[PDB]
Amino acid sequence: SARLRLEARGELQALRIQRYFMDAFQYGKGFSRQILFLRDQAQKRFLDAYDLREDLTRQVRTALAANPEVLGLYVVFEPNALDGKDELFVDQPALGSNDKGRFSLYWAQATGQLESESMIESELADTSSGPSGAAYNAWYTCPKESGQPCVLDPYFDKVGERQLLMTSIAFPLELDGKVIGVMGLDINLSNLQALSEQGNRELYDGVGQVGILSPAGLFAGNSRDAGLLGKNLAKADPQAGELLQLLAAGKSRLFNENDDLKVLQPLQPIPGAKPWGVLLEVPKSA
């Protein structure tokens, strides 16, 4: 019953990752609320859409710098749903406004140097397939179609002049029931790779390995290979479908394999999510 010790250690490493994502979901849940405070204060205070947009753009920047762990913060309202005056803001990026005057804002922190941008209608409608079978624009469309917050399998997006793999916690901005816009947080999958590593060393002094798996089976962290980021389980463990099927079922399993044991620890990143998972592999020696 030394299985139960690794079985236990596994639950400890999964809760480490669940805490990390939950801190972020809590942060964005507050802001998403805060956004809706500001927007309602302008309606009751009878304020200018220009004053609103300039603060909501300032507000977003300020919050991203507060969480050094978030790569970017984005707020996208539905056409004419923040101030009823998108036509008054066409092609004004410094106010979170785009090619059609829509509040589509993104601040990003690739360094503590922050850069912003307005996301044109073509980007918001990009349904390109990612490494998972998911739309590129799922950081906006998942929240809108559901009414609920969404964690996203790993995907590639351009924060500046580099292609970076990341995940996103996407939140709906509801008002009297309807989704009226979407806010979200983006996490560099290098920060989840680092959590892999960090946790592994709390795992028999890192003689083994710990990887994080997306519900699509992509690696969101591998303590042993960082080149396995954005790759299916099948690039490293075809011997996979059994694991990717059990994880979907929120089922744990210890496997007796060669000179090392192994455990899949299913985890719910954010409330209401499809199971994510930590894959342990400690040499049978330790």
Short mmCIF file of C-alpha atoms in Angstrom, two decimals:
data_model
loop_
_atom_site.label_atom_id
_atom_site.label_comp_id
_atom_site.label_asym_id
_atom_site.label_seq_id
_atom_site.Cartn_x
_atom_site.Cartn_y
_atom_site.Cartn_z
CA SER A 1 0.00 0.00 0.00
CA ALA A 2 2.84 2.31 -1.08
CA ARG A 3 0.55 3.00 -4.03
CA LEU A 4 -1.47 5.13 -1.61
CA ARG A 5 1.55 7.29 -0.88
CA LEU A 6 2.05 8.15 -4.56
CA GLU A 7 -1.72 8.18 -4.97
CA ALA A 8 -1.69 10.73 -2.16
CA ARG A 9 1.29 12.70 -3.48
CA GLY A 10 -0.62 12.89 -6.76
CA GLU A 11 -3.63 14.57 -5.16
CA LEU A 12 -1.22 17.04 -3.65
CA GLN A 13 0.29 18.02 -7.08
CA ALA A 14 -3.18 18.38 -8.68
CA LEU A 15 -4.40 20.74 -5.99
CA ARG A 16 -1.25 22.79 -6.53
CA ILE A 17 -2.36 23.41 -10.16
CA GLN A 18 -6.04 23.88 -9.16
CA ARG A 19 -5.04 26.65 -6.73
CA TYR A 20 -2.99 28.43 -9.40
CA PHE A 21 -5.87 28.57 -11.88
CA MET A 22 -8.37 29.41 -9.17
CA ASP A 23 -6.34 32.41 -8.02
CA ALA A 24 -6.62 33.63 -11.63
CA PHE A 25 -10.31 32.82 -11.94
CA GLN A 26 -10.91 34.77 -8.74
CA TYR A 27 -8.89 37.74 -10.03
CA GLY A 28 -10.78 37.85 -13.34
CA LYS A 29 -14.11 37.21 -11.76
CA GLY A 30 -13.56 40.28 -9.65
CA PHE A 31 -12.47 42.47 -12.55
CA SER A 32 -15.27 41.29 -14.82
CA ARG A 33 -17.52 42.42 -11.98
CA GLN A 34 -15.54 45.65 -11.63
CA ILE A 35 -16.01 46.31 -15.37
CA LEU A 36 -19.76 46.11 -14.83
CA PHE A 37 -19.53 48.44 -11.86
CA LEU A 38 -17.84 51.11 -13.97
CA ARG A 39 -20.20 50.67 -16.91
CA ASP A 40 -23.30 51.10 -14.60
CA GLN A 41 -21.75 54.06 -12.77
CA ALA A 42 -21.54 55.89 -16.10
CA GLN A 43 -25.21 55.28 -16.84
CA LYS A 44 -26.32 56.50 -13.40
CA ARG A 45 -23.81 59.41 -13.33
CA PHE A 46 -24.79 60.28 -16.95
CA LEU A 47 -21.24 60.18 -18.23
CA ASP A 48 -19.42 60.51 -21.56
CA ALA A 49 -18.57 57.34 -23.45
CA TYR A 50 -15.16 58.89 -24.04
CA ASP A 51 -14.58 59.32 -20.34
CA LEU A 52 -15.84 55.71 -19.78
CA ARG A 53 -13.69 54.13 -22.54
CA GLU A 54 -10.53 56.02 -21.37
CA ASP A 55 -10.89 54.74 -17.76
CA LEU A 56 -11.97 51.19 -18.75
CA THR A 57 -8.79 51.18 -20.87
CA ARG A 58 -6.75 52.58 -17.92
CA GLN A 59 -8.50 50.20 -15.55
CA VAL A 60 -7.62 47.17 -17.64
CA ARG A 61 -3.96 48.17 -17.86
CA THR A 62 -3.77 48.75 -14.08
CA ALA A 63 -5.23 45.32 -13.18
CA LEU A 64 -2.87 43.36 -15.48
CA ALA A 65 0.20 44.94 -13.85
CA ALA A 66 -1.20 43.87 -10.46
CA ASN A 67 -1.07 40.13 -11.39
CA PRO A 68 2.50 39.50 -12.67
CA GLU A 69 1.22 35.97 -13.47
CA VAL A 70 -1.29 37.04 -16.17
CA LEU A 71 0.18 37.55 -19.68
CA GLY A 72 -2.77 39.60 -20.85
CA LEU A 73 -6.17 41.00 -20.04
CA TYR A 74 -8.86 41.51 -22.74
CA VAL A 75 -12.29 43.16 -22.66
CA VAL A 76 -14.60 42.79 -25.72
CA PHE A 77 -18.11 44.22 -25.52
CA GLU A 78 -20.83 43.33 -27.99
CA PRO A 79 -21.46 46.01 -30.68
CA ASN A 80 -22.87 49.23 -29.03
CA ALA A 81 -23.35 47.45 -25.67
CA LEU A 82 -21.04 49.49 -23.40
CA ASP A 83 -22.13 53.06 -24.24
CA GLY A 84 -24.41 52.82 -27.33
CA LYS A 85 -21.87 54.92 -29.24
CA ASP A 86 -19.44 52.62 -31.15
CA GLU A 87 -19.89 54.79 -34.31
CA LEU A 88 -18.40 57.64 -32.34
CA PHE A 89 -15.20 55.65 -31.75
CA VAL A 90 -14.28 53.90 -35.04
CA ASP A 91 -10.50 53.46 -35.54
CA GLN A 92 -9.59 54.83 -32.08
CA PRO A 93 -7.36 52.07 -30.64
CA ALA A 94 -6.06 54.03 -27.58
CA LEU A 95 -9.69 53.96 -26.27
CA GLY A 96 -10.18 50.16 -26.68
CA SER A 97 -12.13 50.89 -29.86
CA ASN A 98 -11.63 49.19 -33.28
CA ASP A 99 -12.37 49.21 -37.02
CA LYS A 100 -16.11 49.38 -36.30
CA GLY A 101 -15.91 51.31 -32.99
CA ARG A 102 -16.27 48.25 -30.78
CA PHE A 103 -14.74 47.94 -27.29
CA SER A 104 -12.24 45.13 -28.13
CA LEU A 105 -9.21 45.80 -25.87
CA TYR A 106 -6.14 43.78 -25.05
CA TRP A 107 -3.33 44.77 -22.71
CA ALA A 108 -0.33 42.43 -22.54
CA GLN A 109 2.69 41.98 -20.17
CA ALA A 110 5.38 39.90 -21.93
CA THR A 111 8.13 41.35 -19.72
CA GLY A 112 6.80 44.84 -16.49
CA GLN A 113 6.45 46.64 -19.86
CA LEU A 114 2.77 46.81 -20.90
CA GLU A 115 1.36 47.22 -24.43
CA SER A 116 -2.25 47.54 -25.61
CA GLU A 117 -4.20 46.99 -28.80
CA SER A 118 -7.68 46.99 -30.27
CA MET A 119 -8.74 43.80 -31.97
CA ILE A 120 -10.36 44.31 -35.34
CA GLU A 121 -13.46 42.48 -36.46
CA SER A 122 -11.48 40.00 -38.56
CA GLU A 123 -9.57 38.76 -35.47
CA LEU A 124 -12.73 38.38 -33.40
CA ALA A 125 -14.17 36.24 -36.22
CA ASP A 126 -11.09 34.05 -36.76
CA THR A 127 -12.30 30.43 -36.29
CA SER A 128 -8.92 28.82 -37.20
CA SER A 129 -8.38 25.38 -35.59
CA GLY A 130 -5.66 25.34 -32.90
CA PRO A 131 -3.53 22.45 -31.57
CA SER A 132 -6.79 21.16 -30.01
CA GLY A 133 -9.81 21.11 -32.39
CA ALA A 134 -10.85 24.54 -30.91
CA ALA A 135 -11.51 27.84 -32.65
CA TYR A 136 -8.85 30.48 -32.40
CA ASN A 137 -11.59 32.92 -31.23
CA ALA A 138 -12.78 30.68 -28.36
CA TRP A 139 -11.48 33.15 -25.77
CA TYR A 140 -14.53 35.17 -26.71
CA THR A 141 -17.02 32.75 -28.21
CA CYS A 142 -17.04 30.07 -25.43
CA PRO A 143 -18.07 32.56 -22.72
CA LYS A 144 -20.70 34.19 -25.06
CA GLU A 145 -22.36 30.97 -26.18
CA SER A 146 -22.49 29.46 -22.60
CA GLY A 147 -23.32 32.18 -20.07
CA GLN A 148 -20.49 30.74 -18.06
CA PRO A 149 -16.73 31.15 -17.49
CA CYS A 150 -14.40 28.98 -19.63
CA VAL A 151 -10.86 27.51 -19.31
CA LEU A 152 -9.38 26.89 -22.75
CA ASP A 153 -7.09 24.11 -23.95
CA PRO A 154 -3.69 25.35 -24.95
CA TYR A 155 -3.58 27.68 -28.04
CA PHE A 156 -1.13 30.03 -29.84
CA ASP A 157 -1.68 33.83 -29.99
CA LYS A 158 0.60 36.80 -30.77
CA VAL A 159 1.51 38.92 -27.76
CA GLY A 160 3.65 41.46 -29.63
CA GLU A 161 5.99 39.94 -32.20
CA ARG A 162 6.23 36.36 -31.08
CA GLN A 163 3.98 33.29 -31.28
CA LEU A 164 3.32 32.17 -27.67
CA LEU A 165 1.30 29.20 -26.40
CA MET A 166 -1.14 30.06 -23.62
CA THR A 167 -4.43 29.20 -21.89
CA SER A 168 -7.23 31.63 -21.18
CA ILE A 169 -9.81 32.06 -18.39
CA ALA A 170 -12.74 33.76 -20.19
CA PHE A 171 -15.60 35.38 -18.37
CA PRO A 172 -19.01 36.50 -19.49
CA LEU A 173 -20.18 40.08 -18.80
CA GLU A 174 -23.86 39.51 -18.05
CA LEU A 175 -26.44 42.23 -17.60
CA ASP A 176 -30.04 41.29 -16.76
CA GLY A 177 -29.36 37.80 -18.13
CA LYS A 178 -27.81 38.56 -21.53
CA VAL A 179 -24.13 38.27 -22.26
CA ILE A 180 -23.19 41.79 -23.35
CA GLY A 181 -19.43 41.29 -23.70
CA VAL A 182 -16.57 39.10 -22.57
CA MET A 183 -13.46 39.64 -20.40
CA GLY A 184 -10.61 37.25 -20.02
CA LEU A 185 -7.17 36.42 -18.69
CA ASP A 186 -4.37 34.77 -20.67
CA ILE A 187 -1.69 32.61 -18.99
CA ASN A 188 1.62 31.90 -20.76
CA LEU A 189 1.85 28.08 -20.88
CA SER A 190 5.46 28.71 -19.75
CA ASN A 191 4.09 29.66 -16.30
CA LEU A 192 2.23 26.34 -16.22
CA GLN A 193 5.41 24.61 -17.42
CA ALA A 194 7.15 26.21 -14.49
CA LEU A 195 4.47 25.02 -12.07
CA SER A 196 5.11 21.46 -13.51
CA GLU A 197 8.76 21.78 -12.64
CA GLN A 198 8.15 23.45 -9.22
CA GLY A 199 5.71 20.74 -8.09
CA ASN A 200 7.82 17.90 -9.35
CA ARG A 201 10.58 18.86 -6.96
CA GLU A 202 8.11 18.48 -4.12
CA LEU A 203 7.71 14.99 -5.57
CA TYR A 204 10.46 12.74 -4.18
CA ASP A 205 13.03 15.54 -4.95
CA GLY A 206 12.19 15.58 -8.64
CA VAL A 207 13.71 12.18 -9.41
CA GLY A 208 10.41 11.56 -11.23
CA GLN A 209 8.34 13.73 -13.56
CA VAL A 210 5.09 15.70 -13.54
CA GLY A 211 3.17 16.92 -16.58
CA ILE A 212 -0.11 18.86 -16.92
CA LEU A 213 -2.57 17.62 -19.59
CA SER A 214 -5.41 19.63 -21.26
CA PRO A 215 -8.78 17.93 -21.79
CA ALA A 216 -7.78 17.69 -25.51
CA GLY A 217 -4.67 15.77 -24.43
CA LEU A 218 -2.15 18.59 -24.95
CA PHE A 219 0.72 19.11 -22.51
CA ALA A 220 0.38 22.35 -20.51
CA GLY A 221 3.51 21.47 -18.61
CA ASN A 222 6.12 18.68 -18.55
CA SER A 223 8.87 18.82 -15.89
CA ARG A 224 11.11 16.61 -18.13
CA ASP A 225 10.46 17.98 -21.65
CA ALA A 226 9.39 21.63 -22.24
CA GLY A 227 9.36 20.78 -25.93
CA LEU A 228 6.28 18.71 -25.23
CA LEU A 229 4.31 21.96 -24.73
CA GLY A 230 1.35 22.14 -27.13
CA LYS A 231 1.86 18.54 -28.11
CA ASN A 232 -0.56 15.64 -27.74
CA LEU A 233 -0.01 12.92 -25.08
CA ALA A 234 0.66 10.56 -28.10
CA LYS A 235 4.00 12.33 -28.86
CA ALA A 236 5.30 10.91 -25.54
CA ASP A 237 2.94 8.07 -24.48
CA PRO A 238 1.04 6.33 -27.34
CA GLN A 239 0.97 3.08 -25.27
CA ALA A 240 -2.78 7.76 -24.26
CA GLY A 241 -6.30 7.14 -25.52
CA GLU A 242 -6.79 5.14 -22.36
CA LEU A 243 -5.57 8.16 -20.29
CA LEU A 244 -7.41 10.85 -22.38
CA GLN A 245 -10.63 8.83 -21.97
CA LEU A 246 -10.30 8.31 -18.20
CA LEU A 247 -9.47 11.99 -17.59
CA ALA A 248 -12.63 13.00 -19.42
CA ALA A 249 -14.38 10.74 -16.92
CA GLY A 250 -12.83 12.37 -13.83
CA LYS A 251 -11.25 9.03 -13.05
CA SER A 252 -7.88 8.46 -11.33
CA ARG A 253 -5.63 5.52 -12.20
CA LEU A 254 -2.23 4.11 -11.09
CA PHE A 255 -0.42 2.05 -13.72
CA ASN A 256 2.29 -0.52 -13.04
CA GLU A 257 4.72 0.03 -15.95
CA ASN A 258 8.41 -1.10 -16.22
CA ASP A 259 10.80 0.40 -13.68
CA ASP A 260 8.48 3.35 -12.78
CA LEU A 261 4.87 3.65 -11.54
CA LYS A 262 2.52 6.45 -12.88
CA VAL A 263 -0.75 8.24 -11.86
CA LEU A 264 -3.32 10.41 -13.69
CA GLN A 265 -4.79 12.92 -11.27
CA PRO A 266 -7.88 14.52 -12.75
CA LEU A 267 -8.50 18.16 -11.68
CA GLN A 268 -11.10 20.88 -12.35
CA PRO A 269 -9.14 24.01 -13.23
CA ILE A 270 -12.08 26.41 -12.81
CA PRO A 271 -15.51 25.70 -11.43
CA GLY A 272 -17.62 23.72 -13.96
CA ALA A 273 -14.79 22.62 -16.21
CA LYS A 274 -13.91 19.55 -18.18
CA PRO A 275 -11.27 17.57 -16.35
CA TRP A 276 -7.62 18.62 -16.62
CA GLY A 277 -4.93 16.35 -15.36
CA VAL A 278 -1.53 15.84 -13.79
CA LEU A 279 0.45 12.77 -15.03
CA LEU A 280 2.96 11.52 -12.40
CA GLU A 281 5.88 9.19 -13.16
CA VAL A 282 8.21 8.46 -10.23
CA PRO A 283 10.97 5.86 -10.72
CA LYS A 284 9.88 2.65 -8.92
CA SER A 285 13.32 2.94 -7.26
CA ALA A 286 12.37 5.81 -4.90
#
